[PDB]
Amino acid sequence: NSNICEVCNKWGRLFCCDTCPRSFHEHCHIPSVEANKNPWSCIFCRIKTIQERCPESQSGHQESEVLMRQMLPEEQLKCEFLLLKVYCDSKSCFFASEPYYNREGSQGPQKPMWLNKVKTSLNEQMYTRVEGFVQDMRLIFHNHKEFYREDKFTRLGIQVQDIFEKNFRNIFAIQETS
Ligand SMILES: [Zn+2]
Ligand SMILES: [Zn+2]
Ligand SMILES: [Zn+2]
């Protein structure tokens, strides 16, 4: 197994996957690494199993259909994996914790949003459809772009949204287009 967390790339108290060489801090894995379970399989491995059981699940889909799906166990898992892919980028630090807004010439968003809030919402089963999770994720970056205006810091929102969107299209097998 790797000697660093797959998510934050640091050493520490690491839990090792039994079916792949990845390792995780307890609360870096999503869901948080389960208490007992020998053997244990990481979210990467669980996702790969879904695909292997239903190869046709990789055929292209329309985003509108994906958003309307109810959050049954496989969709819950796919949104947890997509959230975890965003935390894997170091630039997620800017979006992780609760923001505050006091900048001359800007007003804060009407509905603030942040990664740890989406993480608790998933853990508490607060989303009934994929659309609810996706809308809160996109809201994080939209709030950032609107608040930072012409400051070059706006680019951090475009960068982390690009990671989200590429991973959304991969995980939910969105039909490729020009
Ligand atoms: Zn970690
Ligand atoms: Zn694994
Ligand atoms: Zn199948």
DSSP letter string, the chain: --SSBTTT---SSEEE-SSSS-EEETTTSSSPPPSS-SS---HHHHHHHHHHH-GGGGS-B-HHHHHT-B--HHHHHHHHHHHHHHHTSGGGHHHHSPP----TT----SS---HHHHHHHHHTT--SBHHHHHHHHHHHHHHHHHHHTTSTTHHHHHHHHHHHHHHHHHHTTBPP--
Nearest of 30, 36, 35, 38 to residue 7 by alpha carbon: 30
Would you say 69 and 129 are in contact if contact means Cβ atoms under 8 Å apart?
yes
Q: Which token pair is 62?
A: 């329309």
How far is the C-alpha of 116 from the C-alpha of 103, rounded, in Å? Answer: 23
Specify whether domain 1-59 bears CATH 3.30.40.10. yes
Residue ranges, comma separated, of all CATH 3.30.40.10 domains in the chain are 1-59
Nearest of 6, 31, 17 to residue 122 by alpha carbon: 31
What is the whole-number distance in angstroms between the Cα of residue 140 and the centre of ligand 2? 29
Quoted resolution (Å)? 1.4
Would you say 5 and 21 are in contact if contact means Cβ atoms under 8 Å apart?
no
What is the whole-number distance in angstroms between the Cα of residue 131 and the centre of ligand 1? 28
Cis peptide before 109 (omega within 30 of 0): no
What is the whole-number distance in angstroms between the Cα of residue 99 and the centre of ligand 1? 22
Considering every ligand atom, which ligand is closest to the CA of 74? 3
The CATH code of domain 60-178 reads 1.20.920.10
Query: Taking the CB of residue 126, how many other CB atoms lie within 10 A of it?
Result: 13
Axis-axis angle for helices 43-53, 73-87 (nearest 10): 130
Residue matched to tokens 């996957």: 17
Residue ranges, comma separated, of all CATH 1.20.920.10 domains in the chain are 60-178
Task: For residue 162, give Cα distances in angstroms to 3, 62, 91.
Answer: 28, 19, 12
Nearest of 96, 98, 121, 94 to residue 109 by alpha carbon: 98
